[PDB]
Amino acid sequence: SHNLKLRFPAEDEFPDLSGHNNHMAKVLTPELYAELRAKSTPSGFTVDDVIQTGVDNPGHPYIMTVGCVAGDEESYDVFKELFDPIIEDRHGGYKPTDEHKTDLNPDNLQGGDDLDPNYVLSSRVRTGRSIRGFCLPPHCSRGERRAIEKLAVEALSSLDGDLAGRYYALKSMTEAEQQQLIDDHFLFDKPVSPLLLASGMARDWPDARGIWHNDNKTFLVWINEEDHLRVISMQKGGNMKEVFTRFCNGLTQIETLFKSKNYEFMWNPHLGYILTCPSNLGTGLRAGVHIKLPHLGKHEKFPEVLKRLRLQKRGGGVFDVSNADRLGFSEVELVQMVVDGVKLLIEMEQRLEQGQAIDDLMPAQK
């Protein structure tokens, strides 16, 4: 009914993106908008819905945001003329005809049981999943969201052994529970990012949002936040293989429990696992270490070494280092790049501790 909009000429509806630094604004032309503005997915998601967050949020002079979302699985097909250039730009030339390979077999990961714990304080692997048949968080109704929560909580409650756990719904969380989850670094709250708020994803908060974690505090699931599920495996030290093993183990057990009720993860062979933001497609995966690199930290070539290693850093020489890629590399490929990359970083750190050069250890661009 409101898509009333189509009675206005395209140019009167077309967003003013003059200031903007985001992927959407780089691709959305007046002709593209005219081509796509009458279209909708079966759940009613439109190109205005796709682009709203990028209209509202112009990015930063020095940081390009994505500037759009999917509202359902179909969005990536119905609006491919928009998403495809964005995905190619964001994902280093990933083409519409490229194939994504999924690989969640930890036997395929070589080594990484052993990352030096005088350097690696901690290891983590995180992803997201969407449940097929439901709209994504920008667009999901209260009913859809409740249904997702019920499915997820029922599956997780079935898990035993190493993955026995419990669920904390945000609406009923106590102050003591909250404080314990903060100390655990397990808590999420309503988003304050305007990138997320502008998409409609925070509606009805805290309805049907919660946190599940295993008793051992090595496996964590967030339900109905940025994506239907966020799934994290973590522990102290340097056994990234153990971390990834538990990660794949938990995912498969969940996935099989959903399958028993005829629910599937959203997935295809081109984009891999489907999630709300195009930046998270393919694997949705961030595998990281918190790593003590005081010397390499201050070193001039360190940004290049990370680049060659296909690695990234964030948060006074403790760095959170992870894989940069998400799409067109398998989960095993990404975790392997972290494992292999970290061993080399530590080698270089050790040169620098000895007052030695590292120049010759500069790796070929992966």
mmCIF file of C-alpha atoms in Angstrom:
data_model
loop_
_atom_site.group_PDB
_atom_site.id
_atom_site.type_symbol
_atom_site.label_atom_id
_atom_site.label_comp_id
_atom_site.label_asym_id
_atom_site.label_seq_id
_atom_site.Cartn_x
_atom_site.Cartn_y
_atom_site.Cartn_z
ATOM 1 C CA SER A 1 0.000 0.000 0.000
ATOM 2 C CA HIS A 2 2.706 2.463 0.931
ATOM 3 C CA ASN A 3 4.882 1.106 -1.796
ATOM 4 C CA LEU A 4 1.831 5.257 -2.789
ATOM 5 C CA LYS A 5 5.574 5.770 -3.235
ATOM 6 C CA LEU A 6 5.229 4.460 -6.868
ATOM 7 C CA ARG A 7 2.831 7.304 -7.611
ATOM 8 C CA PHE A 8 5.778 9.714 -7.025
ATOM 9 C CA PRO A 9 8.312 9.793 -9.837
ATOM 10 C CA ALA A 10 11.538 7.900 -9.095
ATOM 11 C CA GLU A 11 13.592 11.067 -8.734
ATOM 12 C CA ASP A 12 11.328 12.438 -5.978
ATOM 13 C CA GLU A 13 11.881 9.193 -3.969
ATOM 14 C CA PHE A 14 15.552 8.718 -4.740
ATOM 15 C CA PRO A 15 17.682 9.279 -1.616
ATOM 16 C CA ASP A 16 20.097 12.177 -1.237
ATOM 17 C CA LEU A 17 23.429 10.431 -0.826
ATOM 18 C CA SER A 18 25.669 13.347 -1.645
ATOM 19 C CA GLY A 19 27.765 13.215 1.531
ATOM 20 C CA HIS A 20 27.930 9.506 1.869
ATOM 21 C CA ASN A 21 30.766 7.033 2.221
ATOM 22 C CA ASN A 22 29.180 3.645 2.088
ATOM 23 C CA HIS A 23 29.033 0.711 -0.280
ATOM 24 C CA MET A 24 25.409 1.186 -1.059
ATOM 25 C CA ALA A 25 25.843 4.838 -1.992
ATOM 26 C CA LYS A 26 28.770 3.908 -4.261
ATOM 27 C CA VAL A 27 26.480 1.583 -6.312
ATOM 28 C CA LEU A 28 22.956 2.987 -6.177
ATOM 29 C CA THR A 29 22.364 5.100 -9.238
ATOM 30 C CA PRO A 30 19.152 6.787 -10.199
ATOM 31 C CA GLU A 31 18.575 4.156 -12.922
ATOM 32 C CA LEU A 32 19.234 1.251 -10.557
ATOM 33 C CA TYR A 33 16.787 2.706 -8.065
ATOM 34 C CA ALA A 34 14.191 3.193 -10.774
ATOM 35 C CA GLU A 35 14.724 -0.418 -11.883
ATOM 36 C CA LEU A 36 14.359 -1.881 -8.365
ATOM 37 C CA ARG A 37 11.888 0.339 -6.496
ATOM 38 C CA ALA A 38 8.739 -1.447 -7.530
ATOM 39 C CA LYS A 39 10.053 -4.892 -6.640
ATOM 40 C CA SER A 40 9.449 -6.760 -3.421
ATOM 41 C CA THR A 41 10.239 -10.105 -1.828
ATOM 42 C CA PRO A 42 7.451 -12.480 -0.821
ATOM 43 C CA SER A 43 7.549 -11.109 2.741
ATOM 44 C CA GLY A 44 7.219 -7.574 1.364
ATOM 45 C CA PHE A 45 10.880 -6.398 1.717
ATOM 46 C CA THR A 46 11.613 -3.590 -0.751
ATOM 47 C CA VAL A 47 14.732 -1.784 -2.018
ATOM 48 C CA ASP A 48 13.881 1.157 0.267
ATOM 49 C CA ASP A 49 14.022 -1.306 3.124
ATOM 50 C CA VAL A 50 17.320 -2.630 1.924
ATOM 51 C CA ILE A 51 18.968 0.796 1.734
ATOM 52 C CA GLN A 52 17.483 2.655 4.680
ATOM 53 C CA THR A 53 20.403 2.234 7.048
ATOM 54 C CA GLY A 54 22.797 3.590 4.358
ATOM 55 C CA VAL A 55 20.582 6.517 3.679
ATOM 56 C CA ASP A 56 20.519 7.410 7.387
ATOM 57 C CA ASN A 57 24.136 6.683 8.128
ATOM 58 C CA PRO A 58 26.588 8.404 5.767
ATOM 59 C CA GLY A 59 29.663 6.574 6.964
ATOM 60 C CA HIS A 60 32.860 8.243 8.049
ATOM 61 C CA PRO A 61 35.486 10.164 6.088
ATOM 62 C CA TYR A 62 37.950 7.308 6.685
ATOM 63 C CA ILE A 63 35.733 4.269 7.129
ATOM 64 C CA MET A 64 33.320 3.015 4.516
ATOM 65 C CA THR A 65 30.317 1.224 6.000
ATOM 66 C CA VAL A 66 28.155 -1.285 4.101
ATOM 67 C CA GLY A 67 24.951 0.782 4.096
ATOM 68 C CA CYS A 68 22.375 -1.903 3.408
ATOM 69 C CA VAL A 69 20.794 -5.121 4.759
ATOM 70 C CA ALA A 70 18.856 -8.123 3.628
ATOM 71 C CA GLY A 71 15.356 -8.618 5.184
ATOM 72 C CA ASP A 72 14.937 -12.274 4.193
ATOM 73 C CA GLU A 73 16.687 -14.940 2.122
ATOM 74 C CA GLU A 74 15.049 -13.816 -1.099
ATOM 75 C CA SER A 75 16.446 -10.313 -0.767
ATOM 76 C CA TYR A 76 19.836 -11.330 -2.153
ATOM 77 C CA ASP A 77 18.120 -12.590 -5.381
ATOM 78 C CA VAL A 78 15.301 -10.045 -5.833
ATOM 79 C CA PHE A 79 17.827 -7.203 -5.261
ATOM 80 C CA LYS A 80 20.891 -8.828 -6.778
ATOM 81 C CA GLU A 81 21.502 -5.921 -9.073
ATOM 82 C CA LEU A 82 22.316 -3.929 -5.936
ATOM 83 C CA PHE A 83 23.785 -6.563 -3.661
ATOM 84 C CA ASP A 84 26.070 -8.121 -6.321
ATOM 85 C CA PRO A 85 28.234 -5.010 -6.916
ATOM 86 C CA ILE A 86 28.353 -4.338 -3.214
ATOM 87 C CA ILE A 87 29.494 -7.920 -2.506
ATOM 88 C CA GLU A 88 32.110 -7.665 -5.258
ATOM 89 C CA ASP A 89 33.397 -4.372 -3.852
ATOM 90 C CA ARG A 90 33.390 -5.484 -0.225
ATOM 91 C CA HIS A 91 34.690 -8.985 -0.810
ATOM 92 C CA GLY A 92 37.731 -8.234 -3.050
ATOM 93 C CA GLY A 93 36.247 -8.883 -6.452
ATOM 94 C CA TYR A 94 33.852 -11.721 -5.548
ATOM 95 C CA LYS A 95 31.776 -12.201 -8.690
ATOM 96 C CA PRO A 96 28.182 -13.211 -9.240
ATOM 97 C CA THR A 97 29.409 -16.465 -10.799
ATOM 98 C CA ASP A 98 31.875 -17.352 -8.000
ATOM 99 C CA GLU A 99 31.316 -20.317 -5.789
ATOM 100 C CA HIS A 100 31.622 -20.408 -2.024
ATOM 101 C CA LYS A 101 32.826 -23.592 -0.422
ATOM 102 C CA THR A 102 31.766 -24.545 3.052
ATOM 103 C CA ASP A 103 34.123 -26.736 5.134
ATOM 104 C CA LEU A 104 33.304 -27.382 8.773
ATOM 105 C CA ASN A 105 35.460 -30.543 9.176
ATOM 106 C CA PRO A 106 38.109 -29.869 11.800
ATOM 107 C CA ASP A 107 40.104 -32.894 10.604
ATOM 108 C CA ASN A 108 40.998 -30.703 7.586
ATOM 109 C CA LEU A 109 42.759 -28.142 9.827
ATOM 110 C CA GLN A 110 46.490 -28.803 10.135
ATOM 111 C CA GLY A 111 48.158 -28.132 13.464
ATOM 112 C CA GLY A 112 47.031 -25.248 15.656
ATOM 113 C CA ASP A 113 46.712 -27.395 18.817
ATOM 114 C CA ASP A 114 49.865 -25.703 19.998
ATOM 115 C CA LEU A 115 49.896 -21.879 19.502
ATOM 116 C CA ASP A 116 52.542 -20.634 21.931
ATOM 117 C CA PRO A 117 50.742 -19.728 25.186
ATOM 118 C CA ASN A 118 53.479 -17.365 26.305
ATOM 119 C CA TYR A 119 52.123 -15.297 23.385
ATOM 120 C CA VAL A 120 48.471 -16.355 22.785
ATOM 121 C CA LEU A 121 46.331 -15.498 25.707
ATOM 122 C CA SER A 122 43.127 -16.745 24.140
ATOM 123 C CA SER A 123 41.442 -18.261 21.117
ATOM 124 C CA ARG A 124 37.969 -17.765 19.674
ATOM 125 C CA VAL A 125 35.895 -18.697 16.662
ATOM 126 C CA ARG A 126 32.602 -16.889 15.965
ATOM 127 C CA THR A 127 29.941 -17.127 13.251
ATOM 128 C CA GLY A 128 26.244 -16.327 12.569
ATOM 129 C CA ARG A 129 23.335 -18.375 11.208
ATOM 130 C CA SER A 130 19.916 -17.698 9.824
ATOM 131 C CA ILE A 131 16.965 -20.131 10.016
ATOM 132 C CA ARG A 132 15.317 -20.639 6.616
ATOM 133 C CA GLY A 133 11.616 -19.645 6.347
ATOM 134 C CA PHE A 134 11.906 -16.680 8.683
ATOM 135 C CA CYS A 135 12.628 -13.051 7.892
ATOM 136 C CA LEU A 136 15.927 -11.603 9.065
ATOM 137 C CA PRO A 137 16.048 -9.247 12.044
ATOM 138 C CA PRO A 138 15.469 -5.939 10.168
ATOM 139 C CA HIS A 139 12.085 -7.278 9.096
ATOM 140 C CA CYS A 140 10.994 -10.252 11.317
ATOM 141 C CA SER A 141 7.704 -9.967 13.121
ATOM 142 C CA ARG A 142 7.292 -10.613 16.870
ATOM 143 C CA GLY A 143 5.832 -14.014 15.961
ATOM 144 C CA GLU A 144 8.701 -15.020 13.779
ATOM 145 C CA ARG A 145 11.215 -13.966 16.371
ATOM 146 C CA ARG A 146 9.421 -15.897 19.162
ATOM 147 C CA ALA A 147 9.357 -18.945 16.915
ATOM 148 C CA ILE A 148 13.079 -18.746 16.289
ATOM 149 C CA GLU A 149 13.737 -18.404 19.974
ATOM 150 C CA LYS A 150 11.557 -21.431 20.796
ATOM 151 C CA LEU A 151 13.311 -23.592 18.202
ATOM 152 C CA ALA A 152 16.763 -22.514 19.263
ATOM 153 C CA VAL A 153 16.175 -22.844 23.058
ATOM 154 C CA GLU A 154 14.609 -26.330 22.565
ATOM 155 C CA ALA A 155 17.620 -27.482 20.525
ATOM 156 C CA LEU A 156 20.214 -26.055 22.911
ATOM 157 C CA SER A 157 18.471 -27.500 25.964
ATOM 158 C CA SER A 158 18.997 -30.952 24.453
ATOM 159 C CA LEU A 159 22.710 -30.684 24.403
ATOM 160 C CA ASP A 160 24.699 -32.619 27.016
ATOM 161 C CA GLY A 161 28.203 -33.533 28.000
ATOM 162 C CA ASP A 162 30.751 -30.905 27.086
ATOM 163 C CA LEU A 163 27.889 -28.762 25.673
ATOM 164 C CA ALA A 164 25.365 -29.071 28.515
ATOM 165 C CA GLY A 165 24.233 -25.515 29.268
ATOM 166 C CA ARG A 166 21.541 -23.054 30.113
ATOM 167 C CA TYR A 167 19.529 -20.178 28.696
ATOM 168 C CA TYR A 168 19.056 -16.634 29.983
ATOM 169 C CA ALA A 169 16.169 -14.694 28.366
ATOM 170 C CA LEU A 170 16.996 -10.987 28.550
ATOM 171 C CA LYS A 171 13.470 -10.024 29.779
ATOM 172 C CA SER A 172 13.881 -12.155 32.965
ATOM 173 C CA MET A 173 17.591 -11.844 33.565
ATOM 174 C CA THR A 174 18.443 -10.917 37.179
ATOM 175 C CA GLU A 175 20.889 -8.287 38.215
ATOM 176 C CA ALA A 176 23.175 -10.989 39.615
ATOM 177 C CA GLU A 177 22.927 -12.979 36.356
ATOM 178 C CA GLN A 178 23.666 -9.838 34.384
ATOM 179 C CA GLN A 179 26.709 -9.042 36.422
ATOM 180 C CA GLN A 180 28.035 -12.627 36.007
ATOM 181 C CA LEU A 181 27.475 -12.451 32.195
ATOM 182 C CA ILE A 182 29.343 -9.143 32.030
ATOM 183 C CA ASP A 183 32.259 -10.672 33.972
ATOM 184 C CA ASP A 184 32.108 -13.630 31.477
ATOM 185 C CA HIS A 185 32.048 -11.167 28.446
ATOM 186 C CA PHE A 186 28.883 -12.990 27.352
ATOM 187 C CA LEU A 187 26.296 -10.126 27.691
ATOM 188 C CA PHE A 188 24.600 -8.221 24.875
ATOM 189 C CA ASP A 189 22.228 -5.330 25.300
ATOM 190 C CA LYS A 190 19.986 -3.399 22.932
ATOM 191 C CA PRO A 191 22.159 -1.965 20.140
ATOM 192 C CA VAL A 192 23.221 1.604 20.306
ATOM 193 C CA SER A 193 24.804 1.635 16.875
ATOM 194 C CA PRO A 194 22.772 3.833 14.609
ATOM 195 C CA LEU A 195 23.772 1.467 11.751
ATOM 196 C CA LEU A 196 21.756 -1.242 13.356
ATOM 197 C CA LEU A 197 18.966 0.917 14.820
ATOM 198 C CA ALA A 198 18.115 2.473 11.464
ATOM 199 C CA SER A 199 17.387 -0.970 9.951
ATOM 200 C CA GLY A 200 14.445 -1.681 12.276
ATOM 201 C CA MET A 201 16.239 -4.613 13.852
ATOM 202 C CA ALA A 202 15.839 -3.430 17.472
ATOM 203 C CA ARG A 203 12.024 -3.464 17.481
ATOM 204 C CA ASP A 204 10.212 -5.028 20.486
ATOM 205 C CA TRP A 205 13.453 -5.222 22.517
ATOM 206 C CA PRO A 206 13.960 -7.373 24.615
ATOM 207 C CA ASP A 207 11.205 -9.664 23.332
ATOM 208 C CA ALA A 208 12.575 -13.074 22.272
ATOM 209 C CA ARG A 209 16.255 -12.157 22.773
ATOM 210 C CA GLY A 210 18.555 -14.228 24.990
ATOM 211 C CA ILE A 211 21.886 -15.779 25.777
ATOM 212 C CA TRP A 212 22.764 -19.469 26.036
ATOM 213 C CA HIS A 213 26.103 -20.818 27.179
ATOM 214 C CA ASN A 214 27.549 -24.182 28.166
ATOM 215 C CA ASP A 215 28.396 -24.844 31.805
ATOM 216 C CA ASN A 216 32.091 -24.929 30.908
ATOM 217 C CA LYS A 217 31.875 -21.348 29.419
ATOM 218 C CA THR A 218 33.555 -22.378 26.231
ATOM 219 C CA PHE A 219 30.485 -22.180 23.922
ATOM 220 C CA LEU A 220 28.068 -19.281 23.644
ATOM 221 C CA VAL A 221 24.994 -18.551 21.576
ATOM 222 C CA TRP A 222 23.168 -15.278 21.200
ATOM 223 C CA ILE A 223 19.609 -15.485 19.976
ATOM 224 C CA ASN A 224 17.832 -12.851 17.904
ATOM 225 C CA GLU A 225 20.352 -10.033 18.094
ATOM 226 C CA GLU A 226 21.970 -8.894 14.796
ATOM 227 C CA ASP A 227 21.194 -12.270 13.216
ATOM 228 C CA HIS A 228 19.002 -15.158 14.261
ATOM 229 C CA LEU A 229 21.978 -16.928 15.887
ATOM 230 C CA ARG A 230 25.497 -15.949 16.801
ATOM 231 C CA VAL A 231 27.619 -18.947 17.788
ATOM 232 C CA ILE A 232 30.987 -18.628 19.547
ATOM 233 C CA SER A 233 33.595 -21.131 20.734
ATOM 234 C CA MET A 234 36.345 -19.791 23.043
ATOM 235 C CA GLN A 235 38.898 -20.614 25.688
ATOM 236 C CA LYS A 236 42.067 -19.452 27.312
ATOM 237 C CA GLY A 237 45.343 -20.281 25.580
ATOM 238 C CA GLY A 238 46.407 -21.440 22.249
ATOM 239 C CA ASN A 239 44.577 -24.621 21.310
ATOM 240 C CA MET A 240 42.741 -23.116 18.356
ATOM 241 C CA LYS A 241 42.231 -26.649 17.000
ATOM 242 C CA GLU A 242 40.276 -27.574 20.162
ATOM 243 C CA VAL A 243 38.363 -24.282 19.843
ATOM 244 C CA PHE A 244 37.441 -24.982 16.210
ATOM 245 C CA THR A 245 36.610 -28.581 16.965
ATOM 246 C CA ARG A 246 34.079 -27.585 19.580
ATOM 247 C CA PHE A 247 32.775 -24.863 17.214
ATOM 248 C CA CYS A 248 32.051 -27.360 14.431
ATOM 249 C CA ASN A 249 30.746 -29.951 16.943
ATOM 250 C CA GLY A 250 28.234 -27.550 18.456
ATOM 251 C CA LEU A 251 27.088 -26.268 15.050
ATOM 252 C CA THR A 252 26.463 -29.755 13.780
ATOM 253 C CA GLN A 253 24.552 -30.870 16.763
ATOM 254 C CA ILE A 254 22.376 -27.752 16.572
ATOM 255 C CA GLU A 255 21.892 -28.138 12.822
ATOM 256 C CA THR A 256 20.852 -31.810 13.168
ATOM 257 C CA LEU A 257 18.333 -30.923 15.908
ATOM 258 C CA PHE A 258 16.807 -28.243 13.663
ATOM 259 C CA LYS A 259 16.746 -30.692 10.731
ATOM 260 C CA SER A 260 14.757 -33.152 12.824
ATOM 261 C CA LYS A 261 11.958 -30.483 12.926
ATOM 262 C CA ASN A 262 12.489 -29.766 9.201
ATOM 263 C CA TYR A 263 14.325 -26.482 9.717
ATOM 264 C CA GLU A 264 17.428 -25.632 7.759
ATOM 265 C CA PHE A 265 20.127 -22.962 7.900
ATOM 266 C CA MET A 266 19.897 -20.409 5.097
ATOM 267 C CA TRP A 267 22.683 -21.353 2.685
ATOM 268 C CA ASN A 268 23.435 -21.517 -1.048
ATOM 269 C CA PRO A 269 26.530 -22.377 -3.079
ATOM 270 C CA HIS A 270 27.177 -18.808 -4.187
ATOM 271 C CA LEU A 271 26.867 -16.826 -0.943
ATOM 272 C CA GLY A 272 27.339 -19.606 1.594
ATOM 273 C CA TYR A 273 25.456 -18.904 4.849
ATOM 274 C CA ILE A 274 23.026 -16.029 4.493
ATOM 275 C CA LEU A 275 23.075 -13.256 7.138
ATOM 276 C CA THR A 276 21.701 -9.749 7.401
ATOM 277 C CA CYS A 277 24.737 -7.705 6.404
ATOM 278 C CA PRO A 278 26.498 -8.487 3.119
ATOM 279 C CA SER A 279 29.859 -8.166 4.939
ATOM 280 C CA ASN A 280 29.174 -11.334 6.883
ATOM 281 C CA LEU A 281 28.298 -13.673 3.978
ATOM 282 C CA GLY A 282 29.986 -16.924 3.065
ATOM 283 C CA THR A 283 31.247 -18.175 6.421
ATOM 284 C CA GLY A 284 30.293 -15.290 8.700
ATOM 285 C CA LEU A 285 33.436 -16.357 10.500
ATOM 286 C CA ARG A 286 35.938 -14.587 12.665
ATOM 287 C CA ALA A 287 38.645 -16.671 14.201
ATOM 288 C CA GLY A 288 40.966 -14.789 16.457
ATOM 289 C CA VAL A 289 43.599 -14.684 19.047
ATOM 290 C CA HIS A 290 44.486 -12.225 21.738
ATOM 291 C CA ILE A 291 48.233 -12.155 21.305
ATOM 292 C CA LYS A 292 51.148 -10.416 23.077
ATOM 293 C CA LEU A 293 53.277 -8.823 20.356
ATOM 294 C CA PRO A 294 54.967 -5.824 22.171
ATOM 295 C CA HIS A 295 57.848 -5.567 19.671
ATOM 296 C CA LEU A 296 56.007 -6.275 16.379
ATOM 297 C CA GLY A 297 53.303 -3.937 17.728
ATOM 298 C CA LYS A 298 55.522 -0.900 17.269
ATOM 299 C CA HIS A 299 57.079 -2.154 14.025
ATOM 300 C CA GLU A 300 56.706 -0.366 10.689
ATOM 301 C CA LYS A 301 56.130 -3.420 8.462
ATOM 302 C CA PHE A 302 53.523 -5.084 10.851
ATOM 303 C CA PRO A 303 50.579 -3.695 8.875
ATOM 304 C CA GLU A 304 52.130 -5.249 5.712
ATOM 305 C CA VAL A 305 52.818 -8.557 7.433
ATOM 306 C CA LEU A 306 49.145 -8.762 8.469
ATOM 307 C CA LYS A 307 48.043 -7.867 4.974
ATOM 308 C CA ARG A 308 50.223 -10.524 3.372
ATOM 309 C CA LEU A 309 48.873 -13.037 5.906
ATOM 310 C CA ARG A 310 45.223 -12.084 5.065
ATOM 311 C CA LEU A 311 44.915 -11.103 8.681
ATOM 312 C CA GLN A 312 43.481 -8.075 10.608
ATOM 313 C CA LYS A 313 44.012 -6.495 13.949
ATOM 314 C CA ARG A 314 41.901 -4.641 16.485
ATOM 315 C CA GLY A 315 42.021 -4.036 20.310
ATOM 316 C CA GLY A 316 49.532 -1.941 24.897
ATOM 317 C CA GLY A 317 51.054 -4.593 22.552
ATOM 318 C CA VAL A 318 48.154 -7.051 23.104
ATOM 319 C CA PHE A 319 46.291 -7.339 19.723
ATOM 320 C CA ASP A 320 43.073 -9.114 18.717
ATOM 321 C CA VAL A 321 44.193 -10.653 15.404
ATOM 322 C CA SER A 322 41.812 -12.537 13.088
ATOM 323 C CA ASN A 323 41.133 -13.534 9.563
ATOM 324 C CA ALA A 324 40.100 -10.710 7.242
ATOM 325 C CA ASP A 325 38.230 -12.795 4.682
ATOM 326 C CA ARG A 326 34.637 -14.103 5.010
ATOM 327 C CA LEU A 327 33.378 -15.173 1.549
ATOM 328 C CA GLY A 328 35.135 -17.386 -1.069
ATOM 329 C CA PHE A 329 37.276 -19.029 1.613
ATOM 330 C CA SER A 330 36.127 -22.023 3.631
ATOM 331 C CA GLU A 331 35.963 -22.030 7.445
ATOM 332 C CA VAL A 332 38.945 -24.467 7.547
ATOM 333 C CA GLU A 333 40.860 -22.197 5.086
ATOM 334 C CA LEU A 334 40.258 -19.194 7.340
ATOM 335 C CA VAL A 335 41.165 -20.905 10.576
ATOM 336 C CA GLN A 336 44.243 -22.318 8.833
ATOM 337 C CA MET A 337 45.294 -18.804 7.772
ATOM 338 C CA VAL A 338 45.052 -17.692 11.402
ATOM 339 C CA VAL A 339 46.956 -20.706 12.742
ATOM 340 C CA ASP A 340 49.789 -20.433 10.136
ATOM 341 C CA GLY A 341 49.854 -16.602 10.321
ATOM 342 C CA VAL A 342 50.134 -16.549 14.131
ATOM 343 C CA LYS A 343 53.071 -18.990 14.141
ATOM 344 C CA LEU A 344 54.870 -16.673 11.836
ATOM 345 C CA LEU A 345 54.042 -13.541 13.815
ATOM 346 C CA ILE A 346 55.493 -15.164 16.901
ATOM 347 C CA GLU A 347 58.659 -16.074 14.976
ATOM 348 C CA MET A 348 59.089 -12.443 14.005
ATOM 349 C CA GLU A 349 58.327 -11.227 17.497
ATOM 350 C CA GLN A 350 61.116 -13.563 18.722
ATOM 351 C CA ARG A 351 63.576 -12.157 16.189
ATOM 352 C CA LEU A 352 62.711 -8.683 17.454
ATOM 353 C CA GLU A 353 63.102 -9.802 21.086
ATOM 354 C CA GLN A 354 66.647 -10.931 20.188
ATOM 355 C CA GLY A 355 67.311 -7.610 18.512
ATOM 356 C CA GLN A 356 67.376 -9.435 15.147
ATOM 357 C CA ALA A 357 66.063 -8.428 11.744
ATOM 358 C CA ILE A 358 62.756 -9.842 10.421
ATOM 359 C CA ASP A 359 62.907 -8.425 6.935
ATOM 360 C CA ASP A 360 63.615 -11.781 5.337
ATOM 361 C CA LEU A 361 60.524 -13.353 7.025
ATOM 362 C CA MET A 362 58.221 -11.094 5.013
ATOM 363 C CA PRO A 363 55.687 -13.529 3.459
ATOM 364 C CA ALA A 364 54.480 -13.673 -0.101
ATOM 365 C CA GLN A 365 51.033 -12.192 -0.494
ATOM 366 C CA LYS A 366 48.519 -14.965 0.302
#
